[PDB]
Amino acid sequence: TNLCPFDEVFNATRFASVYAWNRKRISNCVADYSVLYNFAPFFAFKCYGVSPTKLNDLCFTNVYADSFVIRGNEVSQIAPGQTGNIADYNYKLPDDFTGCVIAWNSNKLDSKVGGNYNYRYRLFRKSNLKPFERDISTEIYQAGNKPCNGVAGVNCYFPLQSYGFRPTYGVGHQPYRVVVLSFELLHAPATVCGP
Amino acid sequence: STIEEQAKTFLDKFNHEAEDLFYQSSLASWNYNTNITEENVQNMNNAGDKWSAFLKEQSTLAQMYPLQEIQNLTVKLQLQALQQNGSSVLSEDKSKRLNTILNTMSTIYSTGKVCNPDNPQECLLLEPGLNEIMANSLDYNERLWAWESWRSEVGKQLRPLYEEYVVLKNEMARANHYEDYGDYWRGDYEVNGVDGYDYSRGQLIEDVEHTFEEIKPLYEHLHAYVRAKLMNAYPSYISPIGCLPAHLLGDMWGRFWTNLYSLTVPFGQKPNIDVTDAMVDQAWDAQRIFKEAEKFFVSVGLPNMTQGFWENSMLTDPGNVQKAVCHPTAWDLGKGDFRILMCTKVTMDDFLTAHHEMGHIQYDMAYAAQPFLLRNGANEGFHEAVGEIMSLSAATPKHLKSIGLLSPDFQEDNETEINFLLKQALTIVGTLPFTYMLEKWRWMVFKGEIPKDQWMKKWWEMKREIVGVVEPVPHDETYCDPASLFHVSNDYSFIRYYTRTLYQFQFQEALCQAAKHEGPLHKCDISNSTEAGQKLFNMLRLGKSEPWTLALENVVGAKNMNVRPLLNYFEPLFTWLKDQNKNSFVGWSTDWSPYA
Ligand SMILES: *[C@@H]1O[C@H](CO[C@@H]2O[C@@H](C)[C@@H](O)[C@@H](O)[C@@H]2O)[C@@H](O[C@@H]2O[C@H](CO)[C@@H](O)[C@H](O)[C@H]2NC(C)=O)[C@H](O)[C@H]1NC(C)=O
Ligand SMILES: *[C@@H]1O[C@H](CO)[C@@H](O[C@@H]2O[C@H](CO)[C@@H](O)[C@H](O)[C@H]2NC(C)=O)[C@H](O)[C@H]1NC(C)=O
Ligand SMILES: *[C@@H]1O[C@H](CO)[C@@H](O)[C@H](O)[C@H]1NC(C)=O
Ligand SMILES: *[C@@H]1O[C@H](CO)[C@@H](O)[C@H](O)[C@H]1NC(C)=O
Ligand SMILES: *[C@@H]1O[C@H](CO)[C@@H](O)[C@H](O)[C@H]1NC(C)=O
Ligand SMILES: *[C@@H]1O[C@H](CO)[C@@H](O)[C@H](O)[C@H]1NC(C)=O
Ligand SMILES: *[C@@H]1O[C@H](CO)[C@@H](O)[C@H](O)[C@H]1NC(C)=O
Ligand SMILES: [Zn+2]
């Protein structure tokens, strides 16, 4: 029997930055959520709408798995109705969201001595971000009244900035890997549900 | 767009590249301070150079936002710190000359040696050497020899440098829109803006003078008692109505009077409290000392220590394998990294130093959420005050009996109390007039009220009038005695000690009132009192985001520096001293001199 591919999402070797997060569509399979309870240390396992125990006997149409990596003190920012840099310029959740959020520490895999500068996030954006939207543009942000002409300088900034993760940081500044599961039941026949 | 939004964005990009650069400099400095190797020195130098270049480059970019356009009281504070120019307002030649003068004075002070007469093969440095003669000798001529020698060789080689130093440092201050260098130093206590909490740069002098007018009786009685007891060790050199010679105070300058305890003990038969033997007999280590300090801090509601504290901190001497700098220090590397550097030994002194350092660490942890430029104490005085108030509470006999270091059948009498109070007074009360004199003299020198040909004269007219000390031999305008001190040859401010000493007793009185303590103030322990920890935390977590007057008001209820809590601490000693000085003369005359 074809089990759903939850292993290649949770156990992937490399994750993605917040401004370019990874989305995977899951359909035409049977879902076993008990294997999700592996990786015993979970910093956060929260569920809105469905309940974790009753999730097995519920049939849906599609499941979306979204993966990225953030720092420690921003996990509480991955809930409905939150404000901040991550929830306004990087990743936004709807106020009617149904589904689950999982976040766990990855200090032993995403931290290097001297700095891990391969993880980036967005700091400046002209407007807020609509739910489930991606922005991968790298245009110069103008913060004045004079044109930038595509060159960084006075009142002109580069939107994306790195983290630097090092193994001696605190808990709030350590890397955390985050996976968000969203369940959609559309007017198509239900296909995805458990044993 | 408006200037305010532009400034906010600029500060957002600053607060993100400054943290990384500062963390890389701090880690390099820590690595140099644990090991010792040329490679570590090179890395430290490179990191410091990068940090300095970044800060200098970012200071120029902040001069585009006028300060009067912004009304936020939090963006303005960060921009005011960045917009400071410093020595960049001078010409390049003058900047090089000033740096050369500072380096030359530091080198002259650091490597000054005095050779004994008619014997080139025996020369003594300041530390060790003359500092031991001036702290452990009961002779008269030997102390005078070192006292005159240090100010004859080292002192007279620094005056021409000091004159041009003053001349150059006044130009920078006048170019930075100040009156003089003393105003530049006093600008750290200035509060402009918020109503009901404003503080001017001229109010500090008036406050200091008004406070010092209330310490005079207790200091006079202590001076009389010390003078009476010093006549029995030097029978034919002390006048009963005169001033104390400057070479008989247990220190090279007279900053502290601790080393006179063995000569001035009230009751010499009864020993003090020393828990070193109990510490050794119960197999105590540094780990247990720090665990006890952590437990004491947790007992009042403050949090634990981070897991990185127990892994990245060095609490013992490495040994012969490594080579470290054994000076206690609390490090806040940033990004949640807190560490203590200390070569701990099993002794009461280290037992109190651990409390001091972990108080510093807690105060650092309090404001970790504030912006980078506002992560510091309210002014230059609140940090050591919080450090010391922890050490006062941990030395009480009640606290020692609570943790088992002292026998539970130990009864405290009223004589060891006087011994302890006198030991405290010989260090706390004996240094205030010295500090007030030194800052008053430096302020008057910088202002211009003391002509260059009347420096030393004034330095020896105020000492007889405020401190009550007289020079043993005459001096002329070829000496610079004030330059013989570390904080004068090296550019540093020195009123911070006065402010901290006055703040700490206010804090202790407030916390003891919060803890419902009944009795003398010096028998106070704030352990097992949650209400006394929340009040402290309400001030600890502000940082520089609010004026120091409001931060003080959050703890004491008042918005000004006060002296009465200090006087309530020493009341039994004051009564005992008044009873003891019933057959002596209190006060001194400014006419008697040993060389008359
Ligand atoms: C601080 O309190 C602890 C805990 O004592 C309890 O809590 C207090 C608030 C108070 O209500 C006490 O009556 C409680 O017993 C003290 O530690 C205990 O001290 C007693 C003294 O007889 C001793 O019998 C216990 O074994 C101790 N418990 C331990 C060490 O876990 C502590 O002494 C107090 N600190 C002081 C008084 O300075
Ligand atoms: C720091 O110094 C710079 C120049 O060295 C000051 O900037 C100048 O200020 C004057 C004041 O009238 C202006 O006329 C100039 O246009 C400014 N720019 C230059 C390039 O000279 C700056 O004001 C100083 N900082 C402070 C706080 O005064
Ligand atoms: C993830 O992959 C590693 C490497 O093969 C494996 O040891 C581990 O068991 C995997 N995780 C789970 C939950 O199976
Ligand atoms: C720092 O000290 C450790 C401890 O012995 C040593 O192994 C290391 O080589 C030292 N660093 C340098 C640069 O020598
Ligand atoms: C000052 O600006 C900060 C920016 O975050 C804001 O939070 C604060 O409320 C402002 N102060 C006032 C008095 O509006
Ligand atoms: C502090 O740590 C000790 C031991 O690790 C623990 O028993 C205690 O509950 C901790 N206190 C807090 C407030 O977490
Ligand atoms: C201490 O108590 C004794 C007991 O009567 C008393 O005689 C003495 O005056 C008190 N004070 C001092 C300083 O000894
Ligand atoms: Zn300290």
Author numbering:
A (entry chain B): 333 to 527
B (entry chain A): 19 to 614
Please give sentences taken from the publication describing this entry.
The trimeric spike (S) protein is the major glycoprotein on the SARS-CoV-2 envelope and is responsible for engaging the ACE2 receptor for viral entry, and thus, it is a prime target for vaccine design and therapeutic antibody development. Receptor-binding domain (RBD) in the S protein plays an essential role in ACE2 receptor recognition, and mutations in the RBD affecting receptor binding and viral infection have been reported. To unravel the underlying molecular mechanism of the S proteins of Omicron BA.2, BA.2.12.1, BA.2.75, and BA.4/5 bound to hACE2, we determined their atomic structures of the S (BA.2, BA.2.12.1 or BA.4/5) or RBD (BA.2.75) in complex with hACE2 by cryo-EM or X-ray crystallography. According to our previous reports, the binding interface between RBD and ACE2 could be divided into two patches (patch 1 and patch 2).
Compared with RBD from BA.2, the RBD of BA.4/5 has three distinct mutations (L452R, F486V and R493Q), which displays different binding patterns in the complex interface. The KD of BA.4/5 RBD binding to hACE2 was approximately 9.0 ± 1.7 nM, which is ~2.6- and ~1.6-fold higher than that of the PT (23.8 ± 2.6 nM) and BA.2 (14.6 ± 2.1 nM) RBDs, respectively, while BA.2.75 RBD (7.5 ± 0.2 nM) has a similar binding capacity for hACE2 to BA.4/5 (9.0 ± 1.7 nM). Interestingly, the side chain of H34 adopts two alternative conformations in the BA.4/5 RBD/hACE2 complex, in contrast to the other three complexes. H34 of hACE2 forms an H-bond with Y453 of the BA.4/5 RBD or S494 of the BA.2.12.1 RBD. While in BA.2.75 and BA.4/5 RBD, R493 is substituted by Q493, which is hydrogen-bonded with K31 in the BA.4/5 RBD/hACE2 complex. In the BA.4/5 RBD/hACE2 complex, Q493 forms an H-bond with hACE2, as observed in other variants carrying this mutation. Furthermore, Y453, which is close to Q493, forms an additional H-bond with hACE2 in BA.4/5 RBD/hACE2 complex. Although the H-bonds were absent between Q493 and K31 in the BA.2.75 RBD/hACE2 complex, there are more Van der Waals’ contacts between Q493 of BA.2.75 and K31 of hACE2 than that between R493 of BA.2 and K31 of hACE2. In addition, substitution F486V in the BA.4/5 RBD decreases its hydrophobic interactions with L79, M82, and Y83 in hACE2. The binding assay showed that the binding affinity for hACE2 decreased ~9.8 fold when Q493 of BA.4/5 was mutated to R493. The cryo-EM structure of BA.4/5 RBD in complex with hACE2 in this paper further indicates that R493Q reverse mutation makes K31 and its near residues of hACE2 more approach the RBD and form more Van der Waals’ contacts and H-bonds, contributing to the enhanced binding affinity between RBD and hACE2.
